[PDB]
Structure formats: structure tokens, C-alpha cells
Amino acid sequence: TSIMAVTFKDGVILGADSRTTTGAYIANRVTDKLTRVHDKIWCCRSGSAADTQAIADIVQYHLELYTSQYGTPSTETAASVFKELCYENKDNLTAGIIVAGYDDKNKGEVYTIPLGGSVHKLPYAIAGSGSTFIYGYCDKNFRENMSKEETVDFIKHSLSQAIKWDGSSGGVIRMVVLTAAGVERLIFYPDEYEQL
Amino acid sequence: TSIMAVTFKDGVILGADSRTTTGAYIANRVTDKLTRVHDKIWCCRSGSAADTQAIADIVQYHLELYTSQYGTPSTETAASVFKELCYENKDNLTAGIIVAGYDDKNKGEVYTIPLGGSVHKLPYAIAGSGSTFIYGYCDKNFRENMSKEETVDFIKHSLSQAIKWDGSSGGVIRMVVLTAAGVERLIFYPDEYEQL
Amino acid sequence: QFNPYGDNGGTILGIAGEDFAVLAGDTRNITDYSINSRYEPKVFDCGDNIVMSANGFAADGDALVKRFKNSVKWYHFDHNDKKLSINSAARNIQHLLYGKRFFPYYVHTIIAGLDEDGKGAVYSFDPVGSYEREQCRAGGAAASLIMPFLDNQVNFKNQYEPGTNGKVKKPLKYLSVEEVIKLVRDSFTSATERHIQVGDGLEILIVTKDGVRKEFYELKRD
Amino acid sequence: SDPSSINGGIVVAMTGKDCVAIACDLRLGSQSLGVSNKFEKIFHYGHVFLGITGLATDVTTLNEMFRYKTNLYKLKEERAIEPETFTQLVSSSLYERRFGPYFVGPVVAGINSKSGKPFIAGFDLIGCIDEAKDFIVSGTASDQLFGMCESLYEPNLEPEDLFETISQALLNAADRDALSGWGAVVYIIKKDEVVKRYLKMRQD
Amino acid sequence: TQQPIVTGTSVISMKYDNGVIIAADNLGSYGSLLRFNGVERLIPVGDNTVVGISGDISDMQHIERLLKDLVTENAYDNPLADAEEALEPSYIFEYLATVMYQRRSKMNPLWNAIIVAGVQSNGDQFLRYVNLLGVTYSSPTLATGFGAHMANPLLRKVVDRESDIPKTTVQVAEEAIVNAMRVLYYRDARSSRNFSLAIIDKNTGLTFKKNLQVENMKWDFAKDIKGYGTQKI
Amino acid sequence: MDIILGIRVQDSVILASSKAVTRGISVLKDSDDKTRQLSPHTLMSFAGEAGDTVQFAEYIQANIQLYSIREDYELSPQAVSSFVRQELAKSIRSRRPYQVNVLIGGYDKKKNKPELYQIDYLGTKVELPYGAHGYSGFYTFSLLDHHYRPDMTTEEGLDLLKLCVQELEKRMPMDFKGVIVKIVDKDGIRQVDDFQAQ
Amino acid sequence: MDIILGIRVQDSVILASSKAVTRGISVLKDSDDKTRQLSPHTLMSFAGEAGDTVQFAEYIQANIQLYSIREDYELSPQAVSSFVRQELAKSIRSRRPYQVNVLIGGYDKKKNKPELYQIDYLGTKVELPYGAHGYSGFYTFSLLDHHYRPDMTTEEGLDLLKLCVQELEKRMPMDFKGVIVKIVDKDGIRQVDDFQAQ
Amino acid sequence: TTLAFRFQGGIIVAVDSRATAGNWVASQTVKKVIEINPFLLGTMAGGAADCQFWETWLGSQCRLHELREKERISVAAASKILSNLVYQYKGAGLSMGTMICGYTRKEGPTIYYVDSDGTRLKGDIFCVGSGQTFAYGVLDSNYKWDLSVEDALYLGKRSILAAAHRDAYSGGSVNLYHVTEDGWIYHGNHDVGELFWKVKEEEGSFNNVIG
Amino acid sequence: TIVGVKFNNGVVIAADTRSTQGPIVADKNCAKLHRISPKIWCAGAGTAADTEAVTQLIGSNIELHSLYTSREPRVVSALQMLKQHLFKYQGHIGAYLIVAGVDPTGSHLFSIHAHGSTDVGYYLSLGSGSLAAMAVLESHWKQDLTKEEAIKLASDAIQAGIWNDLGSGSNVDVCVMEIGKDAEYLRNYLTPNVREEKQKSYKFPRGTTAVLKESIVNICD
Ligand SMILES: *C(=O)[C@H]1NC[C@@](C)(O)[C@](O)([C@H](CC2CCCCC2)NC(=O)[C@H](Cc2ccc(OC)cc2)NC(=O)[C@H](CCO)NC(=O)CN2CCOCC2)O[C@@H]1C
């Protein structure tokens, strides 16, 4: 798995590969790893598919019940719920989740929750098996307050490298753009990103 | 450990960090991982310090005896001796060695010998624990037939990133330049490479 | 950690007639749940009117057959082209197998031919060289399915004369070659239905005083 | 170690022309030691017959359990349970103990009293239903029984013929298993009458 | 006893009317890392045999050196080294088969699965498999590792039994091999887009094709897939 | 282990049980009665794990004696054995099972027939003409397969036990310090005090 | 395991050795002589692993008998025991050690004194007034710590063994099928054929 | 199941004829007696290959002795050759229990128990194999030194039948041998299938069976 | 070997009919296609008892839910109920399911793994024959299949399993679920593995078996 979320001038962009493997067999080559928990709060799942799905389903429930009572939850609030499940059930979960959402006051925000169940607020976050190969690239190429076109390019270049080296990563590069404008779904096919 | 060798217009450049660790303790923070086996054939050592030293010492012996009889050995010949030791003793060795040498006919050449004891001739090679983090960066930034200044920059930027992310890597960036001109020793201190 | 042994499945069947003998085996070679080959011969003519099959681990099976074929070649060279009697072959194979008592050939081996009186003979072996002459024997994956059927239909076990109150046993008789081939094909069609490692094809080798003849029959390919 | 291999025993069931047959061996042992030559593994609840192989304590426990449940069924329903219905009761009963199962191989045999249709079925220890038209096998010599049944069996056998076939299938399979034999009993089941016969077999 | 380090994935092959085709991708995997991309796993021996090797690359390079020696040693005191007494596929196979079984029997195996494809001097198609256990078998279609699970089923639709071999052309056979390589690139996580393909025909001889790429890939349907069940956007 | 023998003849059940109780390399006692009277015409011999053996026997004895007073009636040997089997069949799937093997010898006053039941710690019950638990069976069953008749008198039954004990004293490794013999017939339970040299 | 006792009195060494050879659940023999005469005035009793026990005894016997013919002279009990200890001390660090424990009882014709040596499979030699190997010692040493005198006659020595055997027959779990007793004195080695009831 | 016992009329040797592969019955028609020479018998229990190979080998070493010493090998010497060989392989995993039964003018009738542990015992009565305890039960309760050649043959036959019945890993048939000063005499193969019912009726035993 | 294939106006599932105990074939013709609801069908691989039990439980709960809400069962409901149950048991219920069906919201195709992970696709395969089947699907699948094309592709995918996988064999079961019409269950759609006539009849001459004792059994109370 290769997943990342990047804050930019207009909001935040989530990106992921589409490969699920059981051993060396690609069980699903068109997986959607970008999961909605609220209108403009999405998360990137990595680790046990069963565990990350069970968690995301429970979070979506909690935020739907939050919305019913107290209105639109903050991106921080969503990350706190993800944390609470991951930390308190650390012994029975193998889940690494990046939480990214667009608030009108806070703009774009990225929270990463590694295995332990700790929370880390970052300008951008990378995770999954394929992330190890692009720590070098991402640190050198990331600038704050990039344009939409620039941020899409940064994620497209980053994940293409992660896919190229990591066998556990591959397929299509899915992206989800979160701005005041709304929610945009992007897809990039091998025949494009491979020759960057 | 972070090690790499890069072919360029005038020859080849070897680069390495200077950190040796036994667990989390830095046993030596000024290690020389760039080892001479002949006038203009050098190797980068990675894995067991004991194993890589024992091997390098035996190779230097073999090439000194080769030179006495048949004159200057080719960079390929040196790589073949490294291979023969590593492959035939694969069960008792934890050694990953990059072999780089300057020939007047063949110019600069890089051979990499991973754990198995296989041989791979490449334009450039990266190895050691810290290499995982710079596969992304190195693939995107490497061009063939770079200048000396350009190649030193490529290695300096590459190893600085490897050092930044890998705990097993750090200290000074040692380089060894191999051209027709001769052998040049370069060193770059943290106060320089950290702020790139 | 490296495992020197494997299982290539398959099943073999030997029946001795009055003046003939048959050694049959399926032509399927498998690894785990994959088919390697639908036609990989397993029963071999070794010369001196002896047919042999070492079923189990194909590598150890081929190795043993190869060493015995070579053993027959050197018996000729060392004893003025004397014919290796089936009983002499049996004792020779015991030594081949027991030689590797502490790293065994992972095979159940059967040889068929004619004894020195012209009567049909079947010798069967355990992996480490234990051997006994028998009237019939099935070896390999589906041995446990076929042997009870042979006991009943070749040696007439648990069968009695109708209306004798189970006092008079069924006369123990010799089967014809046509009657034996029927039992073999029924044994393998049955084995194929109930065992996943058995099917594809059946290859039978028949040994008479005239030599070694081969019959082939299609089996189910699922 | 393996609870299915301590006591030993076998059961086989076959369908014929407007009839079913269910047979079993009589051996109850403790590993190599033979203890009882009278331990029957076939029980009946009305016109529905159940054969059980595996761990002997569980064979006896399940017999007492299914007598208990069929007795209550008959009082509430005011009719005898049918083979198809009983099969489902056995299945749900076994899967109830999914993570602590009875180490058994049950076999249902009988004729639906209303439709007159012959019925047999087999189960794994956690109650997966194996519904075959021809025959069902269970026990320490299941491999052997599968081989005998697959060869000997032909459809639409008369009760007198089906008896000979199931008897020879059991006897020859039992004589190739160390933990099976020591006497055998065959049930020939028709719409109206049921005949029970003890076979003369090897006592080794 | 050892463990494989740098590894090559599936080798696929089949026989057609006049000869044999064999193919293998150009990847050297270091566990989950796709480390080396310029790796040739089809070793031609003379002009009538191609040896496709999967498994440990260090052991592959050893077998590659053994074959170049077999050629050198065969030429010694042999004036018919390029004619009647040239190396046959069957000679090359039986040698490798002998080595593999000896190494397994010394509990120090060559961690490989090998397919010897070629045409004999009498024009007969040769295709036989051998692995680290010394297990050997022939079939109209052969494939190692992942190829055995996905390639064989597809290649067996073209040649199911022996009688189907004379009915299969070079175009049909190659097309089936090229398709099988794409299917492996879809579902094998240790596979590569770049592969080599070798044809040994009893008329046109040895044709070795380098730098082939998997083309005509269906990905467009991916845009329509969203969430893992209940998600609508 | 401990020797537990039972033999059913014409008009009685005879139970022979070893007198030795051993912990480690020491024989702590040489006169242990490895049996409890459940009812006036039902006797149960037992052998197995150190604590479980007596605890289980006394527990069964308590339950049968309670039933006897409640109903003012003696349960049939068949009924008692069925109760015991179920208790062991429960035990085997409990947190810590009773590791106890039992013989139940009883005279059914209703049928006027002796009955011998053999039950292991799993709850495996079976009715036998003769029974043994542990390693005793390995030698005694072939003896009794040879010498046993169903029409034998109690006197013939004791002679047949004497023959079983002699064989166990010859071929068994451990000194089990002889046996206590008890006869169960129509007149209840009595102990043969003279088996040291009968 | 097997019982190996040795007792040194005024003018003799007495060796008592169990007659039982057991394998699994059966007693294969009840008349086994667990001793070899090394020389006319030196006797060695032995117990341990099934094969090693006799193989080692016969090997030592062969070497002492060879020395006796070469020198036409009998080695002192001390000298024989020192040879045996060294063979076991070699064995313990070999590929497969001899798992054998020995008592060496000998009359030194030079010193005119009986001598008893106890050696275990490690090569741990010690000279004792009385000795035992395995579990026998746990009961016999304390008994012998109280009843032993150095001036005891051979007759008193046999009475003291009878007392040791009685205790082992009372408190030891396994039936060792009695003992074979052998006296080593100035007149050589004789066997007490009447210890079944002395 | 194998036994050999010594009486007034010489030695009786009786064996079953079953080969097992766990709970699988490999064969019901098998030989567990090796006729080494006309006055030397070897019984076989344990590993099939181990027994067959080394007892066939013992036969070779016994022939080699009479060629060398121009004399028949003694039972003691023959037994100790197998004993010493087996001891060389101790810990290797050889599994065999065997009785070497023979008659020489020196020794008279002699039986030697030899097992793969290296144990070598002389004795008058031995039962070896999975069913040894069952054979012992019948044999010990009927043994006298003064049995007729006819009665001793029967007790041996009956002792195997008892073991064939109770022991799951014994049966098929009973092979009888009688050892006099004139050598071994084969007293036939008795299928347990037919012998059981014959004995049951004629003797009145096996009252634990239905029929 | 089980597959699911979406066509333009519905979804089809197919399966083989081989039940195995280790290397032995227990049932030569068992139905692996189960009905959760009238228009939601399930194909099961893994622990046989587990796939049957979990399908019957969710099927029962889906019926009760359908009566309660007075609505047609939805596939996403069967999916959510199966995944939440399988997840709770941490994979100890070894059920691997392809759940397909039509409902008011259209046609649906999902796979469920034993640990409670779900996938959505146009073509899926599970079981020992998964890779043999997926090879055929990845070769022949296109977008906008007809009903007859989808049945052909699904059937071809199971045949790949039957021939090339030892775990799979015998016959092909198919269930077609079209948006407009009733779901049609095609039990033994293909029977390409019919047993050839035996070489001999093994009918015994009456009186062959030896009988000791005979008695009539009492069935009537
Ligand atoms: C009386 O007590 C009989 N009890 C039956 C039995 C079977 O235990 C046996 O010992 C019988 C002995 C005769 C010897 C002469 C030839 C016929 C057999 N033993 C076996 O049949 C033997 C059992 C056995 C197997 C293994 C071991 O040690 C591991 C001990 C005993 N069976 C075999 O050897 C089978 C032959 C059938 O294929 N082979 C294997 O199990 C194959 N493995 C053998 C071990 O090495 C690996 C290969 O007779 C006594 C007297």
C-alpha cells in the first residue's frame, strides 16, 4: 500500500494506489483505499483491510451521530475518534490511517495515526509499505501553500515512485480533492504515471 | 548504513555515511566504509563489519597477487572475486558490497553484490539500511554522463536524505572520486549537508 | 527450513495371473493443488521381462528406477548376459532401498513379471526395503481405496458358496488377462471419482512369456 | 491425541429400490487394546436411523441427546420426525458446539413415511450436511469404505441384493483397518418392515 | 539449507506445430522491493535450446556459468561441435536435472524452477521442467511458480492434449504467451511489465526478442469503483 | 497403574482392586480399599489421578445414598452406571476433568442377574462379562477370553481371579501389594478376607 | 531402576543384584545375573541403559582377562577400579557415552583385605564400606548407617543384606524379583543359591 | 505377535502374519520366521525392513561361520552376532525385537531374546511385539515343562490367536514351528478367520463374542 | 471454485460441485450456491459448515428485517451483516463468500473474506480454483456484457477451476439475477464429468455373505 494526504492553498488532497495483496497474489487491482467518514472528512486506510474497514465504518457512524446532535464535526474531532478506537484496541488492530478534511475556518488539515494509536498533525503525511521509498523524494519536493495543479503533480510523482519500487503497491492512482468548491474524484492510469 | 557509487563523464564516485551501530549505541561515528582493494578499484561495505572487512582483506590479497602476475585487474575482475567469496559462503556471511573502479578503456563502472552473492552492473547503485528512503529521490534525479560537481551534489543530496530518515546512518559523508586524474578524498560535515 | 521431500500423488496397481502379470498406474503428476502433467509415464519396462513403478516422490521414484535399470545392465556385464529372475530383482531392490535407510526414497515400489516356473509374480516394497511376494497390490495415494476391492474381487475375501450357511468358502481361482484388465480399469475409474490426485490417463503394462505389451485408457481430467 | 482414532469404528449407508440400508462394526477399543465386541453404533428414533462413529463417549452422549429431542418433537408435533427434518436437527445440534465440537461422524438413513422416498445423509463433526443419492461412509476406515462403495454400488438394488453389496463393502473395508471389525450388524429398511442381521466376520 | 534472496518470478512456455515458445519477465525482486529491472532469465544454449530460470538469481547466475562451461567443454576434441555432436536440449536438461537432484540430496539445493525449451536434431519439440527438489515432468504447456496457477489454465485452452500441438501455429501460440504475461502482470505482485520471449522453430531457428512490454491493458473500468460496499461517491 | 479387575459369573460380580498407593519411589500404604459401596447391591472400584480418584467416588456415593433415602428405593445397577457415565461425560469438557476410571459391579434384584459396567474418564460405558482398567487389561483379557464361562459358580469365579492375579504378579513391573476381593450377589456385598493365600 | 547393592565386612565383599529385566509393561526375565567376574578375586555388578550395561561389563572383563594372561598375575581390586573409572571418564565425553553404573567388589590377596568401589557413568569413583546405585541408596544407606559394623562376619553381612532387601521389597514401587547374592573373599567368588528364603 | 517357549519335547515357535502402516493393514500374509539353517530359527517384530535385512544378513554370517569352522554356528554365537551389529547402530533408530531359537548338541534347545536396544537374554519363555502381553496371559497360565509335542504346538497356536483377537496390530494367520534335535518342522499356516470359530466351538472359549 | 460477473442489466454467480475431506471427494454434486433472499444469492468457499451456517443466519435475519421494514432486502444489508459477524469472530468462522443480487437500488457484486474485509468489482473469484478462474476472467471480461455473454464467461471461469484445480471438479451451478425479472437458479447448468459405464457388474449371488443371527426390528410404538 502507498497512501498520502497533502495540505495546499485551497484545501487538502488525499492520494492512494489501488493494489490489495494476500501474499504475492493481487486479490484486488482496483481497490478504493480513500474512504469517506463525512462530507469533507476522508481517510486513507493501510494495514489489515478487515480492521481498517471495521474502524472506518464505526467512525462514519460516530460522526453521523455527532452531526445529528452538534452539527459538522472538525477534522481534529474525526482524528480523535479514529485515535480512540486504534489506541484502546492496539492489541487486536493492525491499522495505519491518515485522516484529512476541509474546514472553512481551519482550511485543509492532515492527521496521521500509526500502529500504536498516537496522533500526529502534519502539513503532509505518507504511510503504507510503499511510503519507505519516497521519504527522500517527498521531503525534498514538498512546499507549503502549493496550487491544486502543483499538489496533484507532487502526489502523482510521489505515488508513481512508491508503486515503481514497492511490489505491495500498484494499479491506478486514486485522488480525492477537498476544497470549499466541494469534493473532486481523480484517477490516473499506469500508461500515464509510469512514464514520469 | 547509507552507501552508493555513481558513474559520471570522467569516471565514478563512491559515497558513504560514517555511522556504525551495535543496537542503538553508535560504536563509531567516524567509520571509513569506503575500502581500497586496488589503486583505482574501491568498494562500499554494508552488513556485518567483521564479514565485509574479512572479505575486503581477502579481495585486496587476491588482486595484489593478480597484479604481480597479470598486471592491472579490470573492475569486473574485482567484482567477480567479491561475488565468488559472497556466493560460495552465503550461509555464513551478512555482507552487501558495491564495487566501483576506474579503467582507462571502460571509464567508470559500478557493480553491486547483494546478500545472495549475485552480481549486478548498473550506471549507479545504492545499498545499506538507509538506501530504502532514497530509491524515490535517486531514480528521479540521476542522469548519465553528469559532471564531477553535479555527481558530488547528487551523492551529497542523496546521502543527506538517507542520513536524515535512517537512524542506523549519520556522521560525515565520505566520498572517493575515481578518474584518469587519480584518487580524490572528499568529506562533508553535518553543518553543511543537513541544511540542503 | 528446506524440505528435501515432496508428493507428486498418483496410484499404481499390480495383479498376478496364472501365466501373466499387469502393473498399471495413472499418468497424472501433481504438486499440492496444481497439475504438473496429464501424461507423465510412471510404470517402466526395465528389461529381463520386469516392469517397475516407484510411486510417491517423483524425484526419488525416477532415481530408484534409474539405479535398478542400471543394476540390470551391470548384472548382464558381470554374469555372462544371465537373465535377472524376478525374485533376484526383488532382493536387489531391497538393498537399493535399505542403502538409504536413514535418508529414505519416499516411494512405494511394485515390480511385476514371471517367476522361474512361468507363473505371474507381483513383489511390493515399503520405502526402506521390506518386501513380500503377493497375488495383487495397490500403492500410492488411492492404495487405501483399491486394496479392499482387490481383496474382495481377486482373492474372494468374505465371499462364500450361496446356501452353505457361510461354511464353504468361494473356490480360490485364477483370473484371465481380459478379466484382470476389467478389474484394473474399474479400480482406476473408482479411484479417479473419489481421489483428487488420481485421473487424466491409465497406462497398463502386461508381462507374458512373449514380452511386455502396453494398453492406454482415458481417465477423467477434473 | 486424535479423538476420532482412540475407540475406532465405521458406519456405511446405501439406497436401493424403495429401500435404504445402514451397517456398522461392533468394535470398541482403547488404541491397540480391544475392549468390547458388542458396541453397536446404529440407533433409531421411530423410523429414522442414525449411525455415529468417532469418540465413543460422544456417540453415547449424542444418542441420549437425539432420543431426548425426538421424544419432545413427537409430543409437540404429534407425529414421528422424518429423515430430512432429523438431518437438519443433527446439523444445527452439532454446529451449536462449533468451538467445542462432538468428535463424531453421524449418518442418517430412513424412508420418508409420506413420500416413500429413500433418504441418506452424512455430516462432519461441526454439522456440514453431505446429502448423497448413492451412499454415505464414516469412521476410521472411511478411505476403504469410499473405495468399496464407489466400485460395488449400482443404482436401484432390491433389498436382498442391497444387503449383499453393503455387507461386502463394510466387511472388506473393516479387514483393512486395525481399529474396525470385531463383528458387524446390517439394517435393511423398507416402508413397512426393517430386518436386522449380524454378519460372521474375522475376529482379529 | 539456504533461503532465496534476489528472486525471479514465473517462467511460462508451450509447444506449437513446428517448435516451442518460452517467456519470462526482466525483474529481480528483493522480497517486496522490485530492486533490479535489467535481469535476463532466458539463457540461450547454442541455437536450439533456451533455459528459462525462476527463483534465486545468485543460483541462476551459477547455472548460467555451468551452461557456458558445458558449451566450452563440448567443443573440446569435437570437430562436430557445430553439427552432429552439438549440444541437444535433452543433453542440457538431463545435466541440470542431475545437478538439481544431487544438490537436494546433499541438503544444499539450487533454489530454482527451470524449464528447458528447445528443438532436437530430428525436429522433435523438447519441453521439460526441473526444480530445487530434482522433480521433473513434461507437458504441452509448462510454467513455474505463479505461471503454474494462471498461465497454464490459459495455455491449456490452446493445447489441452498432445493431438492439439500440430493444429497450433506460431501466431496463435505466441499470442497466447503474450496474453498470459499480461494476466501475470495484473495479479502477480512480484511481476514486471518488461519481459523477454524466445521462439525455437525447427525451420526459422532461434528468435530471441528483448525489451517486450505488456500492452492493451484494461484499467478504464477502475474509475467506476468507489468504497468497499456502501460508499456512493 | 493401580489394578482394577471385575468379573461377572452365574449369580455374582467379583471386583479385585490393588492395595498399593505410591507417590514417587515410595509405597505409602499396602492395604488401600479402592472401592465405595454406592448401594447395598451396587459396588464401584476406581483408579486414576491421586486426588480425583476418591473425591469422585465419594461424590457419586453421596448422590446415590441421597436418591436411596428420597425414593426409599435402590436404583438398578444399569441406572447407577448411566448416572456415573453422564457425570464423567460432563467432567471431560469442564475446566479441570476428573481423571478417574471405574468398574461398577451390581446385582439387579429385579432381573435377579449380576451386571458389570466398565466406564473410563471420558464417559465411555460398556457392559462386559469381565473388565479391567489401565495396563491390567493387556494381560487379563486374553486369560479370561480363554478360561471364562457364563455358568461358573462364585467359587469358580474366585479361582479365575486368583489365576489373573498370579499372571499380573509374574509379568507386571510394579509391586501392587496384592488385591482386596469383594463379591456382589443377591445377599449384598461381602469381602473375601482370605485371598492372601486362597 | 535395577537394584545394585554392595557391602564390605571383616573378610569379604557381598554384592546383591536384582534378577528382573523389564521392558515396557512386561517383565521379560526374573533370573538375570547383573554381574561379571573380571578376575578370580574381583567381581563387578552393573545397572543402567539396556544395551550399554552388558556390552561395557563384557568389554572390561575381556581387558582384565587379557592383562591376567599377558602378566600371569591378578591386578589388585584398586588397580581394576582405576582402569574402569578411566574407561567411563573417557566414555562421558565421547560421541555416545556408556550409561552404566558399577560396583566393584574385590579381595586384595596382597593386603588380605576386602575392598568395595562405587563408580557412576561419569567416572566418579569412591571406596565405601557399603554402596548402592539408583533409587536403592535412598533407603539402604540410612539403614546401613545404623546397622553396619566393620568387624561383622560374612554371616552377619548376609543378615544385614536380607534386612536391606526386605526394606526395598516393602517401600520400592517396582517388583525387582529378588536378588542374586555373591561373596568375594580370600577363596574367590561363590554364589549364595539360598537367598530366596535365608 | 511372536512367542518361543522351551519344554520337554524341545522348542515351540509361533508368530502372527500381519504388517501395519499405522492403522492401515499393509498385509495379512507375511513371514515373521527366518529359517537360518535346518536347526536355527529367527522370529521378527518391529520395523519390517530392519528385521528382514539384518536377519537375512545374520543368515549370511551363519553360513560364513560353518564354511570357516567346518561346524554349525551355536545359538549363543548366532544371537550375539545380531546383538553386536544392532548395538553398533544403537540410537540410530533401528526398531526390531527378535528371538533366535535353535538346537545344538552343545547347548540343547536354546532361545535368545535380542532387541534393537542391545538387550540379549537367554530364557525358556519369550513373547515379543505389540501383542506380547496377550500371548503371555494364555501361555503363562498353561505352561508345564511336561507338555506333549501335540499339546505344546496347540498352546503356542492358541497364545497367538488370543493376541490376534485382542491386539488391533496382530492377526491374519498363525505360523507354527517345532524344534527337535533333527531341526525345525513347519506345522502349517492357520488363518485366524477360520481358526477362531473352530477353536471357539471345540474349546468353548471366546464367550465375549456374538455367534 | 466460485465466480461473480456483472452484466449491463444484472449479475450472475457460478460455482463447481466438489466437496473434499483432505484428498478424498466427499460429495461429487453438492450445491455451493445458497439463497440469502429471493434475489440475493451467495457462493461459499472455505470451512463448509461455516459458509452454510453464516448464510442461513444472515438469510434468516434478512427475512425478519424485510418483513419489519415492508421493503425488498438490499445486498449492502446482507454485506454489512455478514462482514460485522465474520469480523466479530476474528476469522475463526472460515467463510469466504461472493454475495450478489438485485434490489430497488440496482444490481450489486461483492466478495467477503473470513476476517470481515469486503471488495466490490464487476468480476470476482474465490476458493482453491480462484487463480485458474481469475486468469480466464482477466482474459475475456469486457464492459457491457449481455446476459448470455456473462453466463458464458462465468461458466468458462468455473471450468478453468474444474480442469486445472484439484480442489474443484464435477459440475457447474449458475444463478442469474436480472434487474427486471425473477432470479433463475440453474442447478447443474453443465455436467461435463459423467462417469463412464463400469466394465463389470459387481451384483453378488444371493447368500454370498455369512449371517449369524436375524430378527425383525420394532418401528411402530
Ligand atoms: C506382533 O506383535 C506383531 N504386531 C504387528 C506389527 C505390525 O507391529 C509387527 O511388528 C510387524 C512386524 C513384521 C516384521 C516382518 C515383516 C512384516 C512386519 N511390523 C510391521 O508391520 C511394521 C510396523 C512398524 C513400523 C515402524 C516401526 O518403527 C517405526 C515399527 C514397527 N510395519 C512397517 O514397517 C511398515 C511396512 C508396511 O509398509 N512400514 C513402515 O512403517 C515404513 N516405515 C518404516 C520405518 O521407517 C520408515 C518407513 O509384527 C509384530 C510381530
Ligand SMILES: *C(=O)[C@H]1NC[C@@](C)(O)[C@](O)([C@H](CC2CCCCC2)NC(=O)[C@H](Cc2ccc(OC)cc2)NC(=O)[C@H](CCO)NC(=O)CN2CCOCC2)O[C@@H]1C
Ligand atoms: C472452489 O474453489 C471450491 N474448492 C473446494 C473447496 C474445498 O475449497 C470449497 O471451499 C468447499 C466449499 C463447499 C464444499 C461443499 C459444502 C459447501 C462448501 N469447501 C470444502 O469442501 C471444505 C474444505 C475445507 C475443509 C477444512 C478447512 O479448514 C480446516 C478448509 C476447507 N470441506 C470441509 O470443510 C469438510 C466438509 C466438506 O464435506 N469439513 C472438514 O474438513 C471439517 N473440518 C472443519 C474445520 O474444523 C475442523 C474439521 O469449495 C470451493 C468453493
Ligand SMILES: [Cl-]
Ligand atoms: Cl501496508
Ligand SMILES: [Cl-]
Ligand atoms: Cl567498519
Ligand SMILES: [Cl-]
Ligand atoms: Cl546495513
Ligand SMILES: [Mg+2]
Ligand atoms: Mg541519522
Ligand SMILES: [Mg+2]
Ligand atoms: Mg479439478
Ligand SMILES: [Mg+2]
Ligand atoms: Mg481389522
Ligand SMILES: [Mg+2]
Ligand atoms: Mg472403557
Ligand SMILES: [Mg+2]
Ligand atoms: Mg488384531
